[PDB]
Amino acid sequence: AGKITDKIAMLGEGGVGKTSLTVNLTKHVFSETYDPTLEDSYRRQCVIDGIPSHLEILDTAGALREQWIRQNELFVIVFDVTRRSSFEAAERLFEEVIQTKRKLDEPFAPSLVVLVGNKCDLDTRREVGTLEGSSLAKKLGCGFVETSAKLGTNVEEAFFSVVRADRRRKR
Ligand SMILES: Nc1nc2c(ncn2[C@@H]2O[C@H](COP(=O)(O)OP(=O)(O)O)[C@@H](O)[C@H]2O)c(=O)[nH]1
Ligand SMILES: [Mg+2]
Ligand SMILES: [Mg+2]
Structure with missing residues:
Protein backbone atom coordinates (compact mmCIF):
# COMPACT_ATOMS: atom_id res chain seq x y z
CA ALA A 1 0.00 0.00 0.00
CA GLY A 2 1.16 3.51 -0.83
CA LYS A 3 3.62 2.48 -3.54
CA ILE A 4 3.66 4.01 -7.02
CA THR A 5 0.83 2.50 -9.02
CA ASP A 6 1.18 4.28 -12.39
CA LYS A 7 4.06 5.79 -14.36
CA ILE A 8 3.06 8.62 -16.65
CA ALA A 9 5.32 10.60 -18.99
CA MET A 10 4.68 14.20 -20.12
CA LEU A 11 5.50 14.89 -23.77
CA GLY A 12 5.16 18.03 -25.91
CA GLU A 13 7.18 20.93 -27.29
CA GLY A 14 8.65 23.56 -25.01
CA GLY A 15 6.27 26.12 -23.57
CA VAL A 16 3.02 24.14 -23.96
CA GLY A 17 2.45 23.82 -20.24
CA LYS A 18 3.93 20.43 -19.26
CA THR A 19 5.54 21.58 -16.00
CA SER A 20 2.60 23.84 -15.12
CA LEU A 21 0.12 20.97 -15.57
CA THR A 22 2.19 18.60 -13.42
CA VAL A 23 2.79 21.15 -10.63
CA ASN A 24 -0.92 21.98 -10.63
CA LEU A 25 -2.00 18.33 -10.57
CA THR A 26 0.34 17.43 -7.71
CA LYS A 27 -0.53 20.45 -5.55
CA HIS A 28 3.14 21.46 -5.33
CA VAL A 29 3.89 24.28 -2.83
CA PHE A 30 4.73 26.96 -5.36
CA SER A 31 1.98 25.74 -7.65
CA GLU A 32 2.09 28.89 -9.74
CA THR A 33 5.82 29.34 -10.29
CA TYR A 34 7.77 26.12 -9.61
CA ASP A 35 9.94 25.45 -12.67
CA PRO A 36 13.42 24.06 -12.05
CA THR A 37 16.01 24.20 -14.83
CA LEU A 38 16.41 20.45 -14.45
CA GLU A 39 12.98 18.76 -14.63
CA SER A 86 2.67 22.59 -31.05
CA PHE A 87 -0.43 20.68 -32.14
CA GLU A 88 1.46 19.37 -35.14
CA ALA A 89 4.34 18.20 -32.95
CA ALA A 90 1.94 16.47 -30.58
CA GLU A 91 0.60 14.40 -33.50
CA ARG A 92 4.18 13.47 -34.44
CA LEU A 93 4.90 12.60 -30.78
CA PHE A 94 1.92 10.27 -30.65
CA GLU A 95 3.41 8.31 -33.58
CA GLU A 96 6.77 8.14 -31.78
CA VAL A 97 5.01 6.70 -28.74
CA ILE A 98 3.11 4.02 -30.68
CA GLN A 99 6.14 2.99 -32.78
CA THR A 100 8.40 2.80 -29.74
CA LYS A 101 5.83 0.79 -27.75
CA ARG A 102 5.37 -1.46 -30.80
CA LYS A 103 9.11 -2.18 -30.75
CA LEU A 104 9.01 -3.39 -27.15
CA ASP A 105 5.79 -5.40 -27.42
CA GLU A 106 7.81 -7.80 -29.60
CA PRO A 107 0.03 -4.88 -25.58
CA PHE A 108 0.16 -1.08 -25.62
CA ALA A 109 -2.93 0.67 -26.99
CA PRO A 110 -3.66 4.26 -28.12
CA SER A 111 -6.13 4.65 -25.24
CA LEU A 112 -3.13 4.79 -22.85
CA VAL A 113 -2.35 8.19 -24.34
CA VAL A 114 -4.21 11.43 -23.82
CA LEU A 115 -3.78 14.48 -26.03
CA VAL A 116 -4.13 17.62 -23.96
CA GLY A 117 -5.05 21.00 -25.42
CA ASN A 118 -3.64 23.33 -22.76
CA LYS A 119 -4.07 27.08 -22.19
CA CYS A 120 -7.79 26.90 -22.91
CA ASP A 121 -8.28 30.03 -20.75
CA LEU A 122 -6.69 31.79 -23.75
CA ASP A 123 -9.83 31.29 -25.80
CA THR A 124 -9.59 34.64 -27.62
CA ARG A 125 -6.19 33.61 -28.98
CA ARG A 126 -6.66 30.00 -29.96
CA GLU A 127 -5.23 28.72 -33.26
CA VAL A 128 -6.48 25.15 -32.82
CA GLY A 129 -10.21 24.43 -32.45
CA THR A 130 -11.80 22.08 -29.93
CA LEU A 131 -13.50 19.98 -32.61
CA GLU A 132 -10.16 19.72 -34.45
CA GLY A 133 -8.34 18.35 -31.42
CA SER A 134 -11.23 16.04 -30.74
CA SER A 135 -11.22 14.64 -34.29
CA LEU A 136 -7.47 14.04 -34.35
CA ALA A 137 -7.71 12.08 -31.11
CA LYS A 138 -10.60 10.06 -32.53
CA LYS A 139 -8.62 9.35 -35.68
CA LEU A 140 -5.65 8.12 -33.59
CA GLY A 141 -7.66 6.16 -31.00
CA CYS A 142 -6.49 8.29 -28.06
CA GLY A 143 -8.05 10.57 -25.47
CA PHE A 144 -8.54 14.32 -25.76
CA VAL A 145 -8.98 16.79 -22.91
CA GLU A 146 -8.79 20.59 -22.90
CA THR A 147 -7.14 22.15 -19.85
CA SER A 148 -5.94 25.31 -18.18
CA ALA A 149 -2.91 24.64 -15.98
CA LYS A 150 -3.23 28.26 -14.87
CA LEU A 151 -6.80 27.95 -13.61
CA GLY A 152 -6.65 24.23 -12.82
CA THR A 153 -9.50 23.59 -15.25
CA ASN A 154 -9.88 19.91 -16.19
CA VAL A 155 -6.35 19.09 -15.05
CA GLU A 156 -7.33 16.06 -12.93
CA GLU A 157 -9.66 14.78 -15.67
CA ALA A 158 -6.77 14.87 -18.13
CA PHE A 159 -4.27 12.88 -16.04
CA PHE A 160 -6.83 10.46 -14.62
CA SER A 161 -8.17 9.74 -18.11
CA VAL A 162 -5.31 7.42 -19.00
CA VAL A 163 -5.58 5.55 -15.72
CA ARG A 164 -9.32 5.16 -16.34
CA ALA A 165 -8.61 3.87 -19.85
CA ASP A 166 -6.06 1.31 -18.61
CA ARG A 167 -8.65 -0.03 -16.17
CA ARG A 168 -11.35 -0.04 -18.84
CA ARG A 169 -9.12 -2.39 -20.86
CA LYS A 170 -8.93 -5.13 -18.23
CA ARG A 171 -12.48 -6.03 -19.25
N1 LIG B 1 -2.65 31.34 -19.71
C1 LIG B 1 -2.05 30.14 -19.50
N2 LIG B 1 -0.70 30.07 -19.46
C2 LIG B 1 -0.08 28.89 -19.24
C3 LIG B 1 -0.88 27.68 -19.05
N3 LIG B 1 -0.02 26.66 -18.86
C4 LIG B 1 1.23 27.17 -18.92
N4 LIG B 1 1.19 28.50 -19.14
C5 LIG B 1 2.34 29.42 -19.29
O1 LIG B 1 3.12 28.89 -20.34
C6 LIG B 1 4.49 29.17 -20.12
C7 LIG B 1 5.23 27.85 -20.25
O2 LIG B 1 4.74 26.98 -19.23
P1 LIG B 1 5.60 25.69 -18.84
O3 LIG B 1 4.83 24.92 -17.79
O4 LIG B 1 6.96 26.08 -18.34
O5 LIG B 1 5.66 24.89 -20.26
P2 LIG B 1 6.57 23.60 -20.63
O6 LIG B 1 7.82 24.05 -21.37
O7 LIG B 1 5.75 22.66 -21.50
O8 LIG B 1 6.94 22.90 -19.34
C8 LIG B 1 4.59 29.78 -18.74
O9 LIG B 1 4.69 31.21 -18.85
C9 LIG B 1 3.27 29.42 -18.10
O10 LIG B 1 2.87 30.38 -17.13
C10 LIG B 1 -2.34 27.85 -19.11
O11 LIG B 1 -3.09 26.87 -18.96
N5 LIG B 1 -2.83 29.07 -19.34
MG1 LIG C 1 8.86 22.36 -18.43
MG1 LIG D 1 15.02 18.16 -9.21
Missing part, protein backbone atom coordinates in the same frame (compact mmCIF):
# COMPACT_ATOMS: atom_id res chain seq x y z
CA ASP A 40 11.62 16.78 -11.71
CA SER A 41 9.57 13.63 -11.37
CA TYR A 42 6.37 14.49 -9.47
CA ARG A 43 3.91 12.46 -7.39
CA ARG A 44 0.18 12.59 -6.78
CA GLN A 45 -1.50 10.35 -4.22
CA CYS A 46 -5.20 10.30 -5.04
CA VAL A 47 -8.31 8.18 -5.26
CA ILE A 48 -9.44 7.60 -8.84
CA ASP A 49 -12.95 6.18 -9.15
CA GLY A 50 -12.78 4.66 -5.66
CA ILE A 51 -9.33 3.11 -6.10
CA PRO A 52 -6.37 4.62 -4.21
CA SER A 53 -3.65 5.40 -6.76
CA HIS A 54 -0.16 6.92 -6.64
CA LEU A 55 0.88 8.55 -9.90
CA GLU A 56 4.53 9.22 -10.67
CA ILE A 57 4.76 11.80 -13.44
CA LEU A 58 7.91 12.31 -15.48
CA ASP A 59 8.17 15.95 -16.55
CA THR A 60 10.40 16.27 -19.61
CA ALA A 61 12.31 18.79 -21.67
CA GLY A 62 14.95 12.15 -30.08
CA ALA A 63 16.95 9.36 -28.43
CA LEU A 64 16.31 10.65 -24.91
CA ARG A 65 12.60 10.86 -25.71
CA GLU A 66 12.77 7.14 -26.50
CA GLN A 67 14.06 6.38 -23.00
CA TRP A 68 11.24 8.43 -21.49
CA ILE A 69 8.80 6.26 -23.46
CA ARG A 70 10.30 2.88 -22.55
CA GLN A 71 10.20 3.72 -18.84
CA ASN A 72 6.56 4.84 -18.64
CA GLU A 73 3.18 3.10 -19.05
CA LEU A 74 0.84 6.01 -19.76
CA PHE A 75 1.27 9.26 -21.65
CA VAL A 76 0.06 12.82 -21.59
CA ILE A 77 0.95 14.59 -24.83
CA VAL A 78 0.46 18.32 -24.41
CA PHE A 79 -0.05 21.06 -26.99
CA ASP A 80 -0.85 24.79 -26.66
CA VAL A 81 -4.19 25.63 -28.19
CA THR A 82 -2.78 29.04 -29.12
CA ARG A 83 0.08 27.54 -31.17
CA ARG A 84 -0.74 25.34 -34.13
CA SER A 85 2.89 24.22 -34.51
